[PDB]
């Protein structure tokens, strides 16, 4: 009964034989401070006592990073006392800093697990110190995946976790449908304990988006293209991270909730047109040529039914999509999902039954109010809140919500309803009783030996064997013991040496002679492709306003009957950026798309996913360069002695002209260490993963495939490797 209670500013009061935290510091037990009453009654009493601005402060969520290790940043006082915010996004890398690190510049420091816990405890202490002592919630993007983070236990990327899951279901069933969720559960158990231990109880994620459009740069963090497998992953992720104890309101929230998920990006951010992402003005559009809008919010249905705490809608504009459960011929507003009542209030809450709160994507008011290009900031804030969005990521100006209330552009009925939905989980999660964590217990949880072992295990099972030729001497893989080995790509020489091979290193500096691979028993290449689009400028005549770069075929007709600027299907790629069309209320607006900060290629190269194409592209880079790989593969005798490990960050195309298909073995890796790849390469473990998305063999397939449809079975050329494909060793 008596829950653990910590209080560093307000004090504890004993009542009816129990102890309670006096958070209003009135000296008396208020029903909201009484942990014995149902959550609704505590909310009602708390909401009852709050000022208007106090309730408005709940509708904001903003970056609050530790600074230098783990001091509170400049804006903490302003956010907590002037804006009355209680929701923050924590973005520092958590790891052990190398000797010598001298905090300098205006970057974002690395902090140890205890330093992070110390910083988040300080924020909770500043929160306790506010008039009513409401606690704080921190959110974070994922931290547990290898970037091919810090001291968090390392796992393959999301698609690698699905690969492991599919492949373990096949090794026990001979079938790859929706996977063995024990793999996912085992992953999420490690993430939960490590996050909770630093006082990190909220997540911007995971992504339920489907990888049905291979040209979308964010396929790097999607699990799969299959709605049904996504649905099963979402279900297990919520059950493991939030728990299976549901409130009467149907939310998996207890004090035993380690991380409350904000599933993103509703209703599904996968089917972007030409793969262009709506962080940017040319990529506002989401299109559904195969009519799978219903399929794409299916994982969200599964997460909602398991009680996910929160939903983040995406920036995208759904084009000509029938309202689900509406009168025929009706379509959803051609505006960002977060501003459409039909989506946030109608689809999500009425049709899919969501009873939680809604968290906008970051920066929808100032930067990405798609469909509301001409509207003001106060107008955009009102439309988002009135459409159904309860908290605004990236907006930190509480006075705008209060001005809108006094101008009757938002009601007290709406703000109260927001306050109740945002406050509810903090209550069910037990943060009103104890919101603190032990820094020292963080140091013993984040990156524990058994946690790293579960990751390494998931790493080894994520690897997908695509190709393993049978030579005269048997299959290429596993490697035979010992030999001369050529390495190229991100291989650590000594690590490969340590398995007892004499290693020739083809990775040399620019001004240096690469040793030839001639006479090698084995060539190990580890390769990928990156975008390199940091030079992009929307209003530069040589780039975004360059007629030689073509036109943006995306058409979005505004509900008002006229096309959105730059999206009439005839305009220069850059013309959609506000710095070009200037329809806002600002003198010389800055460009939203410059430097393509978030990822993705130049929009006019978004369809170049084949390695030959990418080598030649302006804003794509093959690493190591396709030229070098091809030199190397010819210097060896039989290409059958080259083993390609490919990081398919996007469903890249092994095109026939590149010759990569001539390798004796090809593997799909979704993020792993040298030592985990070597253990599978040498046969200490057999590969058993299966593809969670299909791979194509021609650029024509990439351009023909329906952005909302999984696979390439509707194309002339079709798939090189189907979903669910993966070899193993056969002895
Ligand atoms: O990380 C966030 O805040 C969330 O919003 C979006 O990412 C942004 C991050 C920073 C900024 N910014 O600094 O302006 C803008 C956008 C993503 O679409 C979403 O997946 C993510 O969880
Ligand atoms: Zn006092
Ligand atoms: Zn009190
Ligand atoms: Zn009221
Ligand atoms: Zn105030
Ligand atoms: Zn407050
Ligand atoms: Zn990427
Ligand atoms: Zn189920
Ligand atoms: Zn788009
Ligand atoms: Zn303000
Ligand atoms: Zn009034
Ligand atoms: Zn302690
Ligand atoms: Zn543990
Ligand atoms: Zn054999
Ligand atoms: Zn030696
Ligand atoms: Zn020309
Ligand atoms: Zn060019
Ligand atoms: Zn317009
Ligand atoms: Zn104006
Ligand atoms: Zn050369
Ligand atoms: Zn497709
Ligand atoms: Zn053809």
């Amino acid at each position: 009964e008596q829950p653990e209670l910590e209080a560093r500013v307000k004090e504890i009061i004993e009542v009816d034989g129990y102890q309670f935290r006096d958070l209003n510091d009135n000296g008396e037990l208020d029903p909201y401070e009484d942990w014995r009453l149902p959550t609704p009654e505590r909310v009602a009493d708390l909401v009852g006592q709050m000022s208007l601005v106090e309730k408005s402060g709940l509708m904001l969520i903003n970056t609050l990073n530790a600074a230098c290790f783990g001091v509170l940043p400049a804006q903490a006082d302003n956010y907590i006392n002037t804006q009355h915010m209680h929701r923050f996004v924590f973005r520092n890398v958590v790891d052990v800093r190398a000797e010598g690190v001298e905090c300098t510049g205006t970057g974002t420091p690395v902090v140890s697990p205890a330093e992070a816990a110390t910083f988040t405890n300080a924020v909770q202490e500043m929160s306790e110190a506010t008039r009513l002592g409401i606690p704080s919630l921190f959110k974070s993007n994922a931290r547990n995946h290898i970037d091919p983070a810090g001291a968090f236990s390392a796992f393959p990327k999301e698609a690698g976790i699905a690969a492991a899951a599919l492949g373990e279901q096949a090794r026990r069933t001979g079938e790859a449908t929706t996977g063995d969720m024990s793999v996912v559960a085992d992953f999420a158990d490690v993430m939960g304990e490590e996050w909770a231990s630093i006082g990190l109880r909220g997540m911007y994620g995971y992504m339920a988006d489907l990888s049905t459009e291979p040209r979308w740069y964010r396929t790097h963090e999607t699990f799969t293209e299959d709605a049904y497998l996504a649905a099963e992953i979402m279900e297990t992720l919520v059950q493991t991270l939030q728990g299976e104890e549901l409130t009467d309101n149907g939310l998996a929230l207890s004090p035993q909730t380690r991380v409350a998920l904000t599933l993103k990006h509703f209703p599904g951010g996968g089917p972007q047109e030409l793969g262009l992402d709506p962080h940017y003005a040319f990529g506002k559009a989401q299109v559904y040529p195969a009519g799978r809008f219903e399929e794409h919010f299916l994982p969200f249905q599964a997460a909602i039914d398991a009680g996910v705490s929160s939903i983040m809608p995406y920036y995208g504009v759904p084009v000509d999509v029938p309202v689900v459960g509406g009168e025929p011929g009706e379509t959803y507003p051609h505006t960002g999902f977060a501003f459409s009542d039909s989506i946030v209030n109608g689809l999500l809450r009425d049709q899919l039954g969501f009873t939680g709160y809604v968290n906008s994507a970051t920066g929808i008011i100032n930067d990405r109010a798609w469909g509301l290009e001409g509207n003001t900031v106060p107008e955009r804030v009102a439309a988002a809140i009135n459409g159904g969005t309860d908290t605004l990521s990236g907006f930190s100006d509480v006075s705008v919500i209060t001005d809108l209330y006094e101008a009757d552009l938002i009601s007290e009925e709406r703000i109260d309803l927001a306050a109740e939905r945002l406050l509810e989980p903090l209550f069910d999660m037990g943060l009103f009783e104890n919101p603190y964590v032990d820094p020292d217990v963080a140091t013993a949880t984040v990156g524990a030996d058994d946690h790293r072992a579960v990751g390494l295990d998931l790493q080894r099972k994520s690897l997908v064997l695509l190709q393993n030729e049978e030579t005269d001497e048997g299959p290429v893989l596993p490697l035979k013991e010992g030999g001369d080995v050529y390495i190229l790509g991100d291989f650590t020489e000594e690590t490969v040496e340590s398995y007892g091979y004499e290693v020739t290193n083809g990775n040399v500096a620019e001004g240096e002679e690469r040793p030839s691979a001639a006479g090698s028993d084995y060539v190990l290449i580890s390769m990928t492709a990156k975008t390199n689009a940091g030079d992009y400028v929307s209003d530069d005549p040589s780039l975004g306003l360059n007629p030689d770069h073509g036109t943006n075929p995306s058409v979005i007709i505004g509900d008002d009957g006229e096309p959105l600027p730059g999206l009439d299907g005839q305009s220069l790629w850059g013309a959609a950026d506000v710095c070009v069309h200037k329809e806002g209320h600002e003198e010389n607006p800055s460009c939203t798309d410059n430097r393509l900060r978030f990822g993705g290629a130049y929009p006019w190269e978004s369809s170049i996913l084949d390695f030959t194409g990418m080598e030649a592209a302006e804003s794509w880079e093959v690493v190591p360069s396709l030229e070098t790989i091809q030199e190397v593969m010819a210097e060896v005798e039989d290409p059958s002695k080259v083993i390609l490990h490919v990081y398919f960050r996007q469903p890249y195309v092994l095109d026939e002209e590149s010759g990569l298909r001539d390798a004796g073995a090809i593997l799909a890796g979704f993020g792993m260490t040298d030592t985990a790849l070597m253990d599978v390469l040498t046969g200490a473990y057999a590969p058993q993963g299966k593809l969670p998305f299909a791979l194509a063999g021609t650029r024509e397939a990439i351009i023909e495939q329906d952005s909302d449809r999984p696979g390439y079975d509707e194309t002339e050329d079709g798939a090189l490797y189907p979903f669910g494909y993966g070899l193993t060793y056969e002895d």
Side-chain angles (χ1 to χ4, degrees), residues 507-581:
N507 306 304
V508 302
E510 326 73 20
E512 167 183 26
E513 223 209 301
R514 176 179 54 77
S516 152
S520 291
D521 300 314
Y522 287 123
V523 178
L524 310 176
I525 311 173
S526 166
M527 64 179 294
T528 192
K530 333 194 158 146
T531 65
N532 167 33
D535 280 346
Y536 180 73
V537 177
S538 296
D539 61 333
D540 189 334
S542 45
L543 285 172
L545 295 186
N546 194 331
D548 291 330
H549 289 146
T551 66
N552 182 354
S554 180
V555 175
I556 316 181
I557 302 307
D559 314 310
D560 77 343
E562 282 256 289
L564 300 176
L567 292 150
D568 62 355
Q570 305 212 353
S571 312
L572 303 197
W573 290 104
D577 204 334
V578 70
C579 55
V580 173
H581 63 64

Side-chain angles (χ1 to χ4, degrees), residues 647-660:
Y647 172 38
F648 287 92
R649 195 178 325 193
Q650 293 183 232
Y652 297 130
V653 167
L654 301 169
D655 64 281
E656 174 89 303
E657 320 89 58
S658 61
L660 298 173

Side-chain angles (χ1 to χ4, degrees), residues 593-650:
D593 307 352
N594 281 5
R595 316 216 89 253
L596 297 174
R597 328 165 193 307
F598 310 108
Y602 292 168
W604 55 86
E605 295 184 330
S606 70
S607 275
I608 320 293
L609 296 186
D610 53 291
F611 283 99
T612 299
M614 279 177 292
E615 186 82 353
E618 303 173 318
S619 63
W620 286 101
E621 193 192 338
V622 190
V623 297
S625 80
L626 187 48
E627 206 188 347
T628 305
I629 295 173
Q630 288 171 339
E631 291 187 6
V632 164
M633 285 185 80
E635 287 175 339
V636 250
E637 340 318 309
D638 206 3
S640 324
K641 297 146 28 196
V642 196
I643 293 103
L644 289 186
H645 168 258
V646 176
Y647 172 38
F648 287 92
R649 195 178 325 193
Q650 293 183 232

